[PDB]
Design an enzyme around this catalytic site. Structure first.
Site, PDB file in Angstrom:
ATOM      1  N   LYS A 130     -12.942  -8.432  -8.032  1.00  0.00           N
ATOM      2  CA  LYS A 130     -13.068  -8.432  -6.600  1.00  0.00           C
ATOM      3  C   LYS A 130     -15.030  -9.018  -6.837  1.00  0.00           C
ATOM      4  O   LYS A 130     -15.864  -8.364  -7.136  1.00  0.00           O
ATOM      5  CB  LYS A 130     -13.049  -7.859  -5.605  1.00  0.00           C
ATOM      6  CG  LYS A 130     -11.905  -6.417  -5.568  1.00  0.00           C
ATOM      7  CD  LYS A 130     -11.703  -5.196  -4.391  1.00  0.00           C
ATOM      8  CE  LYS A 130     -10.147  -4.813  -3.962  1.00  0.00           C
ATOM      9  NZ  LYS A 130      -9.380  -5.883  -3.720  1.00  0.00           N
ATOM     10  N   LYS A 166       1.065  -1.216   0.032  1.00  0.00           N
ATOM     11  CA  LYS A 166       0.064   0.221  -0.198  1.00  0.00           C
ATOM     12  C   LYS A 166       0.928   1.165   0.098  1.00  0.00           C
ATOM     13  O   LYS A 166       1.620   1.421   0.690  1.00  0.00           O
ATOM     14  CB  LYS A 166      -0.882  -0.314   1.605  1.00  0.00           C
ATOM     15  CG  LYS A 166      -1.534   1.932   1.277  1.00  0.00           C
ATOM     16  CD  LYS A 166      -2.609   1.835   0.427  1.00  0.00           C
ATOM     17  CE  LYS A 166      -2.746   2.965   0.827  1.00  0.00           C
ATOM     18  NZ  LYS A 166      -3.718   3.653  -0.460  1.00  0.00           N
TER      19      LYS A 166
END
Ligand SMILES: O=C(O)CCC(=O)c1ccccc1C(=O)O
Ligand SMILES: O=C(O)CCC(=O)c1ccccc1C(=O)O
Ligand SMILES: [Mg+2]
Ligand SMILES: [Mg+2]
EC number: 4.2.1.113
Lengths: 311, 311
Positions: free
Chosen positions: B202, B98
């Site tokens: 997703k 991240k």
């Protein structure tokens, strides 16, 4: 009384302008809760203090993710020798020192912090709490001056968030927000204004453990838990919050039971090796009776806070 | 309830701005489904999350063409020290890091990616996820600076498709589209505008495994599957999608159960040697009860999402 009882416990030394800690303990389905807002707070601000007490006594707290919590020593605005003795008798490696106490000199603060640093050795961690008593310029100056003793962080150097932000941009020492979190229109300002590196959480003023956890989540900053100088009943909620947080980078200010001459439990939440166990406390009928005062006035105050919370 | 039950599971560390994962589990004829859209999503956006939950609980998933699925380590916006430890203990050769976390510095991002590369060694694969935080110019230079660590691909460097397309034309590092796929009016604009080299899928955001497989075919681009940080129930659906895809050139982001403090199954979906087995998960009444909460609010939210989906 019957279920909700008032108490008045003298402190071993003036702290936060008081020499006696008063409050009310309430027994519920989950256990004991403490409602002990300081005298000056009106019903509107006491509303959340009631919410915290209610949660503790009637709802229970979120399960902990740790079985013990580390704590820091709390050093009041006393002399250097006694300050050093509190540290020596604390069993903690981190100490938070009160500075900028009304009526004292900046020289007193330097001597106190110095004493505390010497008492902890070079390995100790030293924090100072100004309770927002300084303006921006004085804060930058004093922080720089006191940092020769290596500060972990400075808690609430100034009164407002805007001021904290200014100080933060002018000093290298981390800044922690307390009053700007528990006594502010919008606590999120600290986050948006990047006014602090650390956010301090106190269970009662924030409305309870779940409320405090939610606020910690919303701020996205490292957090530390501290007390409002409660009896073991109130401290248990603080411990519950510290034990429920995903991560505890800093020792918590829950070693404040020592500031009181007595407690209301047979097994008080007193730290051992600078650590507190995560457990509910059982109030001792006999211990309370020794410090219990007439409940009428306090019951009326609790009722007012409740109304404010529900309305 | 007896049917839909709500859970609240604390995270070990802050991720995607949250510290607690909430959602609802629903048991149907096919098994268990998870409905866990993040708090801010309205019923219209939640409609697909419900469709995914419904598919899992009531319809079942397309038969898998593989028995196990490879996964990548998920590295939150943590310090370099911990970032390296997560990768070294992941058992994965691929790691997604991240970057551009609100409130952090670009210097932190460089330090984090560097530590991860060092942990995986030379043969490792390193991706970064910006979550659309950068504008075009910033993304172009950051991708260049960070590419000294050999990036596999950059996930959603900017907020819009037009921006991804411009970045893609100026950098040599492959670009992956995620929010531009799951939170867009027209997901196919990514294909039409040739704004990405990889499409991220997703399950919940896309409305289920069958819906995701359909989009995978239409986009005509290489794909990768990743989670929404679900419990094993939700992750099982992600594994199901990965297992039904023609081929998996990229390890999948399904090694997120470790970010949760607990799971609702006695045999949690935790990777071993960088892979997850393709299997149905059995919810534990005991494990669920430990993190279960009053379902009132969540049931109302599920009904709204379901109503929005059916119309
Ligand atoms: O943090 C500690 O060490 C003890 C808690 C404490 O200092 C305190 C106690 C009562 C009122 C305010 C404060 C404060 O943190 O400013
Ligand atoms: O891909 C992974 O490594 C885990 C999935 C992940 O990163 C994620 C988890 C929750 C919300 C958004 C994202 C994302 O990929 O942007
Ligand atoms: Mg303070
Ligand atoms: Mg992504």
């Amino acid at each position: 009384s019957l279920t909700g009882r008032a108490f008045a416990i003298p402190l071993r030394t003036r702290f936060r302008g008081i020499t006696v800690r008063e409050g009310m303990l309430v027994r519920g389905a989950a256990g004991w809760g403490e409602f002990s807002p300081f005298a000056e707070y009106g019903p509107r601000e006491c509303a959340r203090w009631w919410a915290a007490c209610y949660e503790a006594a009637e709802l229970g707290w979120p399960a902990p993710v740790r079985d013990t919590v580390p704590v820091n020593a709390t050093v009041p605005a006393v002399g250097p020798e006694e300050a050093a003795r509190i540290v020596a008798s604390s069993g903690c490696t981190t100490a938070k020192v009160k500075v900028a106490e009304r009526g004292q000199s900046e020289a007193n603060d330097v001597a106190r912090v110095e004493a505390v640093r010497d008492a902890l050795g070079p390995r100790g961690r030293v924090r100072i709490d100004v309770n927002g008593a300084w303006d921006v310029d004085t804060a930058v100056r004093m922080i720089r001056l006191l940092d020769r003793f290596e500060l972990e962080y400075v808690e609430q150097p100034c009164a407002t968030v805007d001021e904290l932000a200014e100080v933060r941009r002018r000093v290298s020492v981390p800044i922690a927000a307390d009053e700007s979190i528990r006594r502010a229109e919008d606590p999120l300002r600290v986050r948006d204004a990047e006014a602090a590196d650390v956010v301090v959480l106190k269970v009662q003023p924030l409305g309870g453990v779940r409320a405090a956890l939610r606020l910690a989540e919303e701020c996205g900053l490292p957090v530390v838990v501290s007390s409002a100088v409660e009896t073991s009943v109130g401290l248990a909620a603080g411990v519950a919050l510290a034990a429920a947080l995903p991560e505890l980078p800093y020792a918590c200010g829950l070693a404040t039971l020592r500031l009181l001459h007595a407690d209301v439990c047979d097994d008080p939440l007193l730290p051992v090796h600078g650590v507190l166990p995560v457990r509910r406390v059982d109030v001792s009928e006999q211990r309370l009776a020794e410090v219990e005062i007439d409940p009428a006035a306090w019951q009326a105050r609790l009722a007012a806070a409740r109304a404010a919370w529900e309305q």
